[PDB]
């Protein structure tokens, strides 16, 4: 009838229903020794491993219970972190070099999920002695490995990677400056006149210039068969003498398949002047290709992709199949608005009461190992909002530029 | 007197561009020459109703286009044939031959096109119980006109020579005296490789040092030395510009609405 959160279940040896027990059966049965038997509400019994989790009518010396006035355990929302203004790279630098608000929370998440060796060689603690570096368009955070170490595969440290930054602009904050042009090349121009020899103003005039460009491709596969039968004989014919006669019959079959596609870009310009009675107006339209550049600024919310890369500990990890052969793992979370299920921490946390939805990380396992409030506080920090002012520059090559003009009237 | 003293460094200046002040641009008379006719249309708009009518349209349009393509084709073929001799009724000895064959073929194509189009329309308002004549003409012509404006001047600066053995600012610090060519854009930002301000401002991040090492130049010459030199190199430039526009085989047209004639 109501969702059951496994972290709230409490076994005593001095009451859960049959329907409730079935919806989270594998959590209850997992928390049981082989051949053990425990009671449920209303005359029912839940049996442990070795009885394959069977739920049957009966009695028991001990009972599975769920508290009156339980809690949901949602992840709390913290206030935003303000980063001093700069361009995109300066703001990214300030975020990844923050120890208390970024480096440690991220390191603990990797640790709690089961990644091995999340730290450097000059400290015994998680998240300490970490090196930060710039790599291509992203950043890499890893424990320092210049000295020696002691442990199985202690030289194989876990990396934290940060990339794909995005901005949610405040609607009233965006501004831009001068737009400049360079390497201008002419495509085409038109000039002309609109003449009105009537006694009223007229607006029924139109001059339009249009330029289009396109590309295309295709691929074809053809297969076929052929069969032929021929006979040859020799005969004596009148006047001509001995003649060789040959007759040939043949047939063929063929099959073919094709796929393809195309892309088109188009730009057009028009002028439509209103002309006074007994007068004329000149018009002009021009089109150029040009390199375009301009400065800009805005205020926004900063989001990014977080990737964890390393090997998973033998003694236990949170991957739902719980592998024990120390495999190398790579997983990406999106810190920000929802995009998908595999990459959403909030989606997976909130659905921990439905066993059929547990396809990636097991968050019930992390709660049992570390405590509910431990996990809530860590995740609230990992998912904390970030805000900053941004300044920057736009540039692009071979874009379009144009000019449309209506001139002064000349009396007829 | 010196090692390779005859191999001197060159400074090259090109690709000038202008940022016009918005209220400064003017142009003069537009003239035409070598005019060739494409097409004309004439006609009448007739209104025999008791109200003015504006529901009339005459439109003339001219289009031109080019295209290209390339194709690559490959294939295979296999054949088996047998031949035997038999004696058949009435016909006698006959040679009989039977042939079976199969084939396969693969092909790939790429291509593209460009189109230019120009059109003109006239839509007159006609008084009640009256008629109006109209005319449209299209020509190809050479176009020319004078102009003037005030602007900010920007350009591309290219340095070309060999790099000194005793030390240079290229981030890999080569020591084999190689010949070098690098271009900076003096003006608004276009890219990172060509922007002095971008590279200077990011000198605190080692992963961004991909071209010139500006920390090296500071250590060698002093911070204020380098600031004053770069401030002069990047100083803004302004001038008034006069000039002339010309282009061949452009379009020219004329659209006319005439005086009404009572019915």
Author numbering:
A (entry chain A): 1 to 14, 25 to 422
B (entry chain B): 160 to 422
What are the paper's exact sentences on this?
We obtained near-atomic resolution (2.2 Å) cryo-EM maps of WT aerolysin solubilized in either amphipols or SMALP, as well as in LMNG-CHS (2.6 Å). The cryoEM map in SMALPs shows an additional density, not observed with amphipol, which allows to partially model some of the lipids surrounding the β-barrel. Additional density is observed in the transmembrane part of the β-barrel in the SMALP data set which cannot be observed in the amphipol data set. This extra density allows one to partially fit some phospholipids and allows one to pinpoint the position of the aromatic belt formed by Y233 and W265 (YW belt) with respect to the membrane. Interestingly, just below the YW belt, two polar residues, E237 on one β-strand and Q263 on the opposite strand, interact with each other and are fully embedded at the core of the membrane hydrophobic environment. The high resolution of our structures allowed us to define a strong interaction of E237 with Q263 which is highlighted by the continuous density between the two residues. Carefully looking at the fitted model, such conformation could only be consistent with the formation of a double H-bond produced by a protonated E237, which is consistent with the expected higher pKa of glutamates within the hydrophobic environment of the membrane. In amphipol, K242 interacts with S256, while E254 interacts with K244; in the SMALP structure, K242 forms a salt-bridge with E254. The overall Cα root-mean-square deviation (RMSD) between the structures in amphipol and SMALP is 0.82 Å for the overall structures and 0.74 Å for the extended β-barrels region (i.e., residues 215–285).
Aerolysin is a β-pore-forming toxin produced by most Aeromonas bacteria, which has attracted large attention in the field of nanopore sensing due to its narrow and charged pore lumen. Pore-forming toxins (PFTs) are important virulence factors of many pathogenic bacteria, which are secreted in a soluble form and upon host membrane binding, they oligomerize into transmembrane pores undergoing a complex structural reorganization. Domains 3 and 4 form the 120 Å long 14-stranded β-barrel, with each protomer contributing two antiparallel β-strands. Four distinct constriction rings, two at each end of the pore, were identified from the structures and confirmed by MD simulation.
